Amino acid sequence: GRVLIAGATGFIGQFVATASLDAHRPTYILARPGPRSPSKAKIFKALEDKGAIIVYGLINEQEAMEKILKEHEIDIVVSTVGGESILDQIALVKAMKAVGTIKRFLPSEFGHDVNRADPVEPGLNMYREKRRVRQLVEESGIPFTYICCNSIASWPYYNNVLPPTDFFQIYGDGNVKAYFVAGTDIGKFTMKTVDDVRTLNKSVHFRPSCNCLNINELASVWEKKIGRTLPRVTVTEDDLLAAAGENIIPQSVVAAFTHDIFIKGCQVNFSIDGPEDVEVTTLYPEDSFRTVEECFGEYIVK
Numbered sequence: 455g456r457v458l459i460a461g462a463t464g465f466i467g468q469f470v471a472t473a474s475l476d477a478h479r480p481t482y483i484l485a486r487p488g489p490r491s492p493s494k495a496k497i498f499k500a501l502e503d504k505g506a507i508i509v510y511g512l513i514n515e516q517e518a519m520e521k522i523l524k525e526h527e528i529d530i531v532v533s534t535v536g537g538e539s540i541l542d543q544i545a546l547v548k549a550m551k552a553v554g555t556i557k558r559f560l561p562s563e564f565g566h567d568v569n570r571a572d573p574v575e576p577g578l579n580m581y582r583e584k585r586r587v588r589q590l591v592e593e594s595g596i597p598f599t600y601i602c603c604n605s606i607a608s609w610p611y612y613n614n615v616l617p618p619t620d621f622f623q624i625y626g627d628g629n630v631k632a633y634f635v636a637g638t639d640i641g642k643f644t645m646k647t648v649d650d651v652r653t654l655n656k657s658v659h660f661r662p663s664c665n666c667l668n669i670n671e672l673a674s675v676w677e678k679k680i681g682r683t684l685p686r687v688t689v690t691e692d693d694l695l696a697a698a699g700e701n702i703i704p705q706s707v708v709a710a711f712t713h714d715i716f717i718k719g720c721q722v723n724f725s726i727d728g729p730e731d732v733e734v735t736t737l738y739p740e741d742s743f744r745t746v747e748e749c750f751g752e753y754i755v756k
């Protein structure tokens with residue numbers, strides 16, 4: 455099963471691409487034509503050394519994408535494009551529909567369940583775009599999997615990776631749970647889903663029970679790691695709504711999602727027992743997630 459990843463030089467994309475190559479899956483990486491940044495240069499080299507095949511194009515160019523999917527006999531398409539580029543996926547979906555040979559598409563999800571969560575603006579606009587892509591995918595008859603992996607295991611700053619050394623900003627009561635997942639686990643478990651019969655036309659939720667922490671708990675894990683306590687200060691709901699209300703992109707987007715998670719409980723407030731939802735830890739039993747303690751341990755080694 456040949457995998458095409460768009461957005462492999464991106465934050466999430468680097469983890470997904472590396473996991474695909476480490477799983478011994480034939481892996482093709484879409485590259486923007488032109489000169490290469492030092493960091494892009496770094497990433498593309500690492501991936502090619504792991505056996506990645508670089509292909510040149512842009513996902514908003516339908517005819518170009520049709521040619522690539524056909525020429526390279528692609529089976530599985532994974533998009534990890536950024537928030538600014540969500541509607542660039544429209545041409546890619548039309549291209550996949552035209553070629554008709556795609557076995558699984560994973561659009562650029564990699565956070566919350568955009569069909570259940572209701573963030574304030576401008577987070578909401580991003581979710582409108584993601585929902586529009588899901589509507590197009592489903593109406594196009596493309597088999598899909600939606601990766602709802604919740605938060606990457608970093609410190610959740612309102613404007614956003616390394617936890618604080620001076621004082622902790624605690625959102626609201628600091629007693630609202632979220633799920634934190636290592637980057638490497640987002641990649642590993644994403645790639646397992648692409649050809650699993652059980653994830654076909656499903657939302658895949660990442661709910662590792664040992665990494666279900668509120669902000670007060672997350673603070674305490676960091677204090678254990680640095681061997682000292684810090685002052686805790688409150689950031690109110692209205693603080694976050696003010697920040698969101700300025701409509702400064704992407705800072706205000708991050709503020710809106712912080713509010714949704716840590717004020718409104720968007721990651722934990724629904725059941726996954728229904729027939730269109732599956733959960734990673736029950737799909738792949740006896741395959742432990744890296745803990746937050748472990749993750750914070752490598753931030754310490756920096």
Ligand SMILES: NC(=O)C1=CN([C@@H]2O[C@H](COP(=O)(O)OP(=O)(O)OC[C@H]3O[C@@H](n4cnc5c(N)ncnc54)[C@H](OP(=O)(O)O)[C@@H]3O)[C@@H](O)[C@H]2O)C=CC1
Pocket residue numbers: 460461462463464465466467484486511512513514534535536537539542562563564565566603604605606
């Ligand atoms: N905590 C969480 O769960 C988080 C989840 N996310 C979600 O992950 C997804 C990816 O975001 P992130 O990792 O921040 O994004 P990035 O901006 O780090 O990476 C985006 C990748 O998409 C590529 N790309 C963008 N447009 C095109 C295009 N038209 N054609 C081909 N390639 C393109 C970029 O290449 P180039 O540089 O050449 O333009 C880059 O390689 C988003 O849906 C975001 O919402 C991400 C961060 C937090």
